[PDB]
Amino acid sequence: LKDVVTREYTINLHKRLHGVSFKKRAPRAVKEIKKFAKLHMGTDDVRLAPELNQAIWKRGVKGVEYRLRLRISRKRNEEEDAKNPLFSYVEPVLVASAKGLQTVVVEED
Amino acid sequence: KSLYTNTSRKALEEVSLKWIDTASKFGKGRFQTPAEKHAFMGTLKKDL
Amino acid sequence: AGMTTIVRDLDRPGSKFHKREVVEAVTVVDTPPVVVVGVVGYVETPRG
Amino acid sequence: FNSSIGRTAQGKEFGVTKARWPAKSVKFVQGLLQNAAANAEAKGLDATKLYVSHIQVNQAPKQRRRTYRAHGRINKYESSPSHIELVVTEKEEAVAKAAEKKVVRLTSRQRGRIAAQKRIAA
RNA sequence: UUGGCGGAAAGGCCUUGGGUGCUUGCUGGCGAAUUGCAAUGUCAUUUUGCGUGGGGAUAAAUCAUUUGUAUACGACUUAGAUGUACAACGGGGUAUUGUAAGCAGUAGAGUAGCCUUGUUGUUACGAUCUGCUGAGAUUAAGCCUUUGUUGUCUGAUUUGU
RNA sequence: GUGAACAGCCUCUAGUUGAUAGAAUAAUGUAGAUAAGGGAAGUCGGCAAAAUAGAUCCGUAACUUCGGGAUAAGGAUUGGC
RNA sequence: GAAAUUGUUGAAAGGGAAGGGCAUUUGAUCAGAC
Numbered sequence: 230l231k232d233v234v235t236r237e238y239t240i241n242l243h244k245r246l247h248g249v250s251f252k253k254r255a256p257r258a259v260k261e262i263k264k265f266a267k268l269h270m271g272t273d274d275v276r277l278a279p280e281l282n283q284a285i286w287k288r289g290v291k292g293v294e295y296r297l298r299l300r301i302s303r304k305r306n307e308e309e310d311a312k313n314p315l316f317s318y319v320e321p322v323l324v325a326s327a328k329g330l331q332t333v334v335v336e337e338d
Numbered sequence: 339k340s341l342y343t344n345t346s347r348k349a350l351e352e353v354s355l356k357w358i359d360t361a362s363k364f365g366k367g368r369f370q371t372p373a374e375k376h377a378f379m380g381t382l383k384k385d386l
Numbered sequence: 387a388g389m390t391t392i393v394r395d396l397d398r399p400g401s402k403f404h405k406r407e408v409v410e411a412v413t414v415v416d417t418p419p420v421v422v423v424g425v426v427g428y429v430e431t432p433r434g
Numbered sequence: 435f436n437s438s439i440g441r442t443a444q445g446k447e448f449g450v451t452k453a454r455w456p457a458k459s460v461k462f463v464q465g466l467l468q469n470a471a472a473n474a475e476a477k478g479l480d481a482t483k484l485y486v487s488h489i490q491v492n493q494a495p496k497q498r499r500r501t502y503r504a505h506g507r508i509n510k511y512e513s514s515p516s517h518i519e520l521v522v523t524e525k526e527e528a529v530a531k532a533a534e535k536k537v538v539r540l541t542s543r544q545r546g547r548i549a550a551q552k553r554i555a556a
Numbered sequence: 557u558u559g560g561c562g563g564a565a566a567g568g569c570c571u572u573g574g575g576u577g578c579u580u581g582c583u584g585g586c587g588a589a590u591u592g593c594a595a596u597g598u599c600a601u602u603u604u605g606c607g608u609g610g611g612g613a614u615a616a617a618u619c620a621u622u623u624g625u626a627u628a629c630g631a632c633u634u635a636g637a638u639g640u641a642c643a644a645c646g647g648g649g650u651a652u653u654g655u656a657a658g659c660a661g662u663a664g665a666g667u668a669g670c671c672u673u674g675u676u677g678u679u680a681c682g683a684u685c686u687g688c689u690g691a692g693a694u695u696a697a698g699c700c701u702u703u704g705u706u707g708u709c710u711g712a713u714u715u716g717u
Numbered sequence: 718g719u720g721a722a723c724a725g726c727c728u729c730u731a732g733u734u735g736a737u738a739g740a741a742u743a744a745u746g747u748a749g750a751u752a753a754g755g756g757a758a759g760u761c762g763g764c765a766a767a768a769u770a771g772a773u774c775c776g777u778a779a780c781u782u783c784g785g786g787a788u789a790a791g792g793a794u795u796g797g798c
Numbered sequence: 799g800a801a802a803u804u805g806u807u808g809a810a811a812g813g814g815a816a817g818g819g820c821a822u823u824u825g826a827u828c829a830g831a832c
Contacts, residue, residue: 236706236707238644238645238706239644239645239646240644240645241644241645241696241697243694243695243696243697244696244697245697246697247696247697248697248742265644268643268644268707268708269643269644269706269707269708270707271708295694328646329646329647330645330646331645331646331704331705331706332644332645332646332705332706332707333705333706334705334706347398348398351397351398352397353394354394354395355392355393355394356393356394356395356407357392357393357394358390358391358392359390359391359392360390362650362651362699363388363389363390363650363699364650364651364695364699364700365650365651365652366651366652367650367651372649379690380690382690382691383689383690383691429563429564430564431563431564431565432564432565433564433565440628440629440630441629441630441631442629442630443618443619443629443630443631444618444619444620445630446618446619446714447618447619447713447714451629451630452630488806488807489806490805490806490807491804491805491806492804492805492806493803493804493805517805519805519806541591541595541597542590542591542592543591543594543595543597544591544597544598545591546590546591546592547591547597547598548591549590549591550591553588554588
């Protein structure tokens, strides 16, 4: 239905990966992004861009960046619609540093 | 309140404080007030 | 609320630290006023 | 079949502390609920007063495999398969009433007492 | 119906007034039979349900989500329908380390070249040094605070004297 | 490549990414560790662990079958430019 | 197409076993005799 909005978020992975096993840090950061998008968009299913997968794993299994800037977008579901008519699709954001930014809404064009 | 009366030569003592610690408990606190910290350190780059 | 440190002058005759400084540990309990709402009466019975 | 299984808060609904989510056993059952529903609708049944009136599970023949144990031993590694039956029925009203007459036998002393009450009041 | 008393588990006791039925206090009239020669010969109170007709009133709990003063799992303790509400961020404070990258310097053991033939001659290399710089980075994951930005707030099950 | 080294550690060619997974982080375990002051008082017993350790220079006892003991013991140094 | 063992429905009982004996109450069922 409505609310096809896309917004930019900063996620603090440092507070979420605190004290996690080293071989699990990058894999758990994957599950944190999906839980993060579900919270802010309410969608059960969350899809990650493969180039966002690179951003998490850029510095190995235990070198995840403290902060990531994300472009989370809610979109209509297609291709034999599942129970959820809306899904969240998450992009990385190319910035010099992800610290000090506030959540903003991206215009639709 | 206490259930009994105790003199005990220790419970009748009049306690008058002299100094209360207000340093940070979130680390090895060094200063008691933000004014004290500003005087010891001086001006910083955060300050204008 | 938490713990903190106090300095006060000990006063007990016959002690080595009489009229001399002692550093001391205290705990602070936060106590706003309590609102009285209701009252209950208790009869004294053979079963308590 | 609950010995030394874990506890969960979602058993409160049923008055139990041990409950579990048998995904394999669930999917088998709801595949047979679908089959019975199709069978009922092929029979002209309403499908709105349908309820599960009978469902039973009993043991199928075992399927055999082998386990290797320490000091050169072989032990059974078996499957416990299931046969499943279920029946869906239309719910109906009360069955019947007005049971048998149950003819009653009175002694002559009891019969006279009854007539004494009829004679004694309107 | 009037007025009291009783909290040990009072839940009952006493009392005022009127109405009503009976009265074996005394003297009369009618009825009983056939349950057949006895057969407990059925008269008590427990709970529940379905009906009427007459009043009375219009909730919560659990699951799911959430917190960590709790925790193996259960369990515990918080929060959530429009607000000194909750959350994600950002800001500030508090802490830890010890002075970031970049740029500049007539700093720098010295070496080599250049000619404009030195006299601070310049250039090339050069660990490190000085200044911007108690800077920069991290700061709740079980730290504190918030006039900022953004979002969220009606899904499931069950319970009745 | 480091390095005396077909050591140990990292990489190239080539080959794998195979061993049921998910969530939490109680006790007790297996494996790995660190501890103030003391320093074997523990224990049958220093069992286990710790300490020493490469290289260069200096120095090296008793005893001896004269070959050894010996790396005896015991000191110093170690980077970069 | 037995038993051990098992599911479903029905009935009943169950305060740290169960099962048994004598006797009877209660519930279910039943033959004979007329």
